[PDB]
Every structure is written in structure tokens, then in C-alpha cells.
Amino acid sequence: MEIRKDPFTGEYILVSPHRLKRPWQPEGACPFCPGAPETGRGWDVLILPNRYPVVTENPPEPTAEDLYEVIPARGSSLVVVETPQHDVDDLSDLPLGQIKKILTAVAEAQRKAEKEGNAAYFLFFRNKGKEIGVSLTHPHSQIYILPVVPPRVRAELQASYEWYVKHGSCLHCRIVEKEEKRLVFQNRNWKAFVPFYAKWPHEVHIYPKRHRSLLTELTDEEVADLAEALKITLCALKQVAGIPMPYIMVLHQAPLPRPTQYYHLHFEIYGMYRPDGKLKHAAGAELGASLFTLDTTPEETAARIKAALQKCLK
Amino acid sequence: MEIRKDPFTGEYILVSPHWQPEGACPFCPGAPETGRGWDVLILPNRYPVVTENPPEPTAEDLYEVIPARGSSLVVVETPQHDVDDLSDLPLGQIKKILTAVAEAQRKAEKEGNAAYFLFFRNKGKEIGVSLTHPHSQIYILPVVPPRVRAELQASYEWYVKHGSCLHCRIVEKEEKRLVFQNRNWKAFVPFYAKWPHEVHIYPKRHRSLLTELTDEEVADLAEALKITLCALKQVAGIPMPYIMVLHQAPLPRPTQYYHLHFEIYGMYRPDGKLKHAAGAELGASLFTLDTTPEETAARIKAALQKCLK
Ligand SMILES: [Fe+3]
Ligand SMILES: [Fe+3]
Ligand SMILES: [Zn+2]
Ligand SMILES: [Zn+2]
Ligand SMILES: [Zn+2]
Ligand SMILES: [Zn+2]
């Protein structure tokens, strides 16, 4: 177990071996349902340790090799169990107040991590869909509390700082305020749009209208309007294809625990069906060279998304 | 159509808006674009992501946009439709595939426009390869792919600091993770492997561009690819889908700090289920492994012994 580093890309690899279950080994009882000694009862939201953590509190001594940088796999890997119900398809299927509690519980986990003062980064994300390898069907999300900043966020951080120095302001605010044609949804505190620089077949970024760099700075009405943002956007993506779409959601926010004027937090949602509902796989172009292609303009895709989003209201 | 640029990550997006008989293969011999009496072809892609005469790029106020100017090609690797993998083909056939790609790169080098020549191959229905007929893709590009750009910086910077090629140094020290070598090439699982079955194939001589390769090096490349890809085909029980990409320098001047290599990402975990790049990977560029690169190198190397031939 250790965090290795790629000397050409700077990307980190969370090496944490665990034995892999054989095809004759049952999947076994849902690890996220209430009523087991692990899970307890009477809860709405359960944050618990991942069964196979990629970062741990007292990690083994890192494997070393002369030319390479290795960091101890230190921190927390957690599962946010989003509801006690097993057969709900999606986060978007849950009631607004249930979404609020999930968000509030995540915010609160971040506070704990902030206070504690070690963890460099709080990474919240969600994978959805059998077709992208989500075998555990019970709605859930993930938190990694990390000793390092995620390389992708680290790159966004540098480019953000360098525009703030040059022009005096945050580029994200400037981008959010200007954008309206590619708008998918907005309310008192959040804007959700297909970015100009979209890479995935149905992409939406969700920004707060006010400049927040950290989850923990959100006002209780911000957190509430966020639940509504997430619900309706996710609902739009669940309906646009004609069949529920697999998707990846990540929270991009500043490192722990001090705020920033140049970086502005956002949720990125990569919806992984093309317009015709066949799956889009990240292949040689994407994984091999970080080159993306789109068979359809982002502007046209915001339309389809916004049009399908109309059905969701109710 | 145009190439858009992500202002936060530096990444490029190739935006390009877009009846035939069932059982028709557009890469099969006797096709409208193919003809007959051929062993290998490099064709224009039917729905190219770059082209020679691209329309005016769609400009936006806060973003950089560049014309979608380049060549998108398919490499039909064989006339036979029914061959599963590049690695089922004989050494001589793989030699003509390599040679063809090299000649097309030389052409692109001489013509003097293209910034980058990107050769890659996707394999397997599970990762979206719906045209089963053995093929490879070339993108001749007006920019340097961002992952390759990054590798260049970091190799450049190391070179300046330590006065030698980091890649040449890395290749010398590979023993434990070695999977195969021959006269001109080494194949190993890198210490920094991020996919479940990753193998990089490097030339022993320092080379930066495919077109510098000698006839003997090409022949030995043919073999290294065959045996390595044979190893990954066998390692999990059934044929494994995979991605292969050639990381080489920009066109057309050789680099002392960068050293060409092929990366192969075999996408089954040891258990034989498909790994998908997800939120950690796409959303954060963090990668996880459930098995050490060392143990995986041993598993591949053990599977590879069956392939020596
Ligand atoms: Fe972002
Ligand atoms: Fe590389
Ligand atoms: Zn359950
Ligand atoms: Zn801002
Ligand atoms: Zn064919
Ligand atoms: Zn070298």
C-alpha cells in the first residue's frame, strides 16, 4: 500500500492491494442497507469507511524505488450512503429534503477534516450506472480525504491563479455570469450549464452564483438550492437519452482548509451516453493522449438537456 | 468543426458535427474505398475529426479556438476480416503495418505542417470498438496532445536538472517488472502503472521519432508487440480489450530529452471484469490499483512464456 507518482504526468496512483473476489464468491448482503451491525438503524444518511480503503489512518510503510516519488497512503476513504432504500435508481430520484441531508452530512464531514488539519484535500464524487462499473446498486457517493491535491484540481488551481494575477479577478465568476445560451438551469444561488470546453457527450458544470471556493462556506439556503440544482440537472440527464444515463459527478473545490479568491468550487457531471443512447468509452484518444472529441456541438447539447429538463419539474 | 481549448486544464476538444448494408465492412478488400491486392492500407477516416481544409472555427469571447486542421486516418492492418487481434498476425505482416505507419509519418514530416503524429489502437467491443476488422488510427494534428505535452515538459525539466534522458535511465533499471526484451526493445510494467494491465514498450537505443527506427529495430518492434499483446490476450483467460498509444516527440525534429514509447492499457482487472475510467480517473486524474505493478508484471511475464514463438 502507497501513493506512487508518475514522473512524466505528475498523476498519483493509489496502490492499495486487496484480494479480488472469485466469480464463485457471492456479492453478499448490501454493505449500505440499514439493520446490520455495520450500518445501524433509524438514519437518513450514513457516512462510513469504505470496505477496501485506498487511503488509511495508519498506512503501511510506502514501497520505495530509486527514481520515483512515493507518499504514504494517508487519509480516509468514505462512502456516503444517500438513503436507507436499496431499489432507488438515482440521487435525482430522492426528495429535495433527502438531498439536503446528504449535502449537509458531506459538508459536516469536511468540517471534521478541516479542523483536524492534516488532510490536504476533500474529494467528493459519485459514479452512477452498471455500464460504467457500479456493481453496488444502492445509491451512494464517495469521499476521499487526501494527503495530496488531485492532479486535475491542481491543474485547474494553477491556471486559475495565473488569470487572477493577470486580470485581477476570478475567471470562473466571469465565465458563470457571462454564460446564458448554454444555460441548463439556475435558481437563487446556482447556475448549471454545458461548458464551452465540454469533453464528454452530456457535460454540465454546476457553479454557485456567489464566489465560494469551499463546500464548508455554503449558506444553508445555498446548500438547499444546491439540492434543487443537483436534483433537476440529474433528472434532466436521466431523461434526455430515453433510458437512464450512466454518469460521473465530481466536486472541484479548493484545497483544505483555507479559501481562495481565484478558484471557485463546482460540480462536474460527465454524462456518458451519446445522443443516440449508446455508451461512450474513454479510449486511446482520451486516456492515451488526453484528446477529446464531440460528434455534436455543446450548444446543441445544452438545448436537448434543457428541453428534457422541462419534464422534470413537478 | 473546430478544436476548442479547456481554459482550466489545457486540454483539447475536437468538435465535429455528424444507409449501408448489414454485414458490410468498410475496411474489407473489395470495398468502394479499398480495392484488392493489398496487405495493409492507410485510409481517410469516414467521419474525420480533422481535415485538410477546415471551416472557419467558431469563435467565443473568453476562449481559445483553433482550426481543425489535420488528417484522420485508419490503418487497415490486414485484408482478413476474421482475425481477432494485431497479435494473431505474423511477424512479417506486423512489419508492413509498422513500416506503413512510419512512411505516412515521414510524409507528414516532409510536408511540414502537422505539429503531431499520433498513432493509436483501440481493441475490443467492451470499450466501444464496433468495427471488428483489425484496424489502427492515426491523427495528424495541428497541436501536441496534452498528455504528450505534459510528458515532454517533465522530461525536458529532468534533462536540464540531471543532464540525461529520464526514459533512457528508467529503461536501464527495469528488471523486476520486465515482461519481455529483445535486441532493440524492452517491455515492462512501469512503477507508475495506472491501468490494471499496463505495459510500456521502449526502444533500447534512445529514439524520439518512429521515423528514426532502423529496419532491424522495426523488425524487432514487430516481435515485441506481437509477444506482449499475445501475453495480454492470454493473461486473464479470455481476450482482453486494450488501448495502445505511441508517445513520441513532435514532428519533425528529434529530441534528446524525450524518448518514444508505446503504452498499452489492458482493461480487465485480474478477475476478468472490465475497468472503467470513472470519477476518480476522469474527474480528478487519480488512479487506483487493486494489485501491485510488480505482481501484475509477474502474471503477464508468466503468461508471456506461452507466447515465445
Ligand atoms: Fe473543473
Ligand atoms: Fe508516456
Ligand atoms: Zn442496500
Ligand atoms: Zn469566482
Ligand atoms: Zn472487414
Ligand atoms: Zn532516452
Side-chain angles (χ1 to χ4, degrees), chain A residues 233-247:
Chain A
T233 311
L234 294 181
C235 174
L237 290 178
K238 186 180 171 165
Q239 279 309 301
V240 58
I243 41 173
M245 185 179 306
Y247 72 78

Side-chain angles (χ1 to χ4, degrees), chain B residues 210-286:
Chain B
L210 187 68
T211 51
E212 294 176 292
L213 290 185
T214 72
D215 219 78
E216 158 184 312
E217 278 166 316
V218 171
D220 293 346
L221 182 45
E223 169 181 85
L225 287 171
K226 193 186 157 79
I227 289 182
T228 314
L229 293 169
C230 183
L232 298 167
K233 190 160 170 181
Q234 309 304 331
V235 68
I238 53 164
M240 193 197 292
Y242 70 76
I243 287 151
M244 175 157 74
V245 60
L246 173 62
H247 285 183
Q248 71 177 314
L251 301 202
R253 133 212 297 140
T255 68
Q256 75 185 340
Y257 55 94
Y258 199 60
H259 182 150
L260 82 83
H261 52 289
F262 288 85
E263 312 201 326
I264 295 162
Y265 316 151
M267 300 300 275
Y268 284 158
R269 291 174 163 113
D271 70 9
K273 88 178 170 282
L274 184 65
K275 174 147 171 43
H276 297 86
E281 301 83 5
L282 303 187
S285 302
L286 288 178

Side-chain angles (χ1 to χ4, degrees), chain B residues 20-21 24-36 38 41 43 46:
Chain B
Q20 293 177 335
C25 174
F27 312 139
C28 260
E33 188 56 28
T34 60
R36 277 183 198 80
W38 56 263
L41 303 164
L43 280 66
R46 293 152 56 187

Side-chain angles (χ1 to χ4, degrees), chain B residues 164-169 171 202-207 255-260:
Chain B
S164 77
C165 179
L166 175 50
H167 304 265
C168 267
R169 194 165 184 175
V171 177
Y202 268 96
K204 282 176 174 170
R205 277 192 191 156
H206 168 99
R207 301 296 206 181
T255 68
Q256 75 185 340
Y257 55 94
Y258 199 60
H259 182 150
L260 82 83

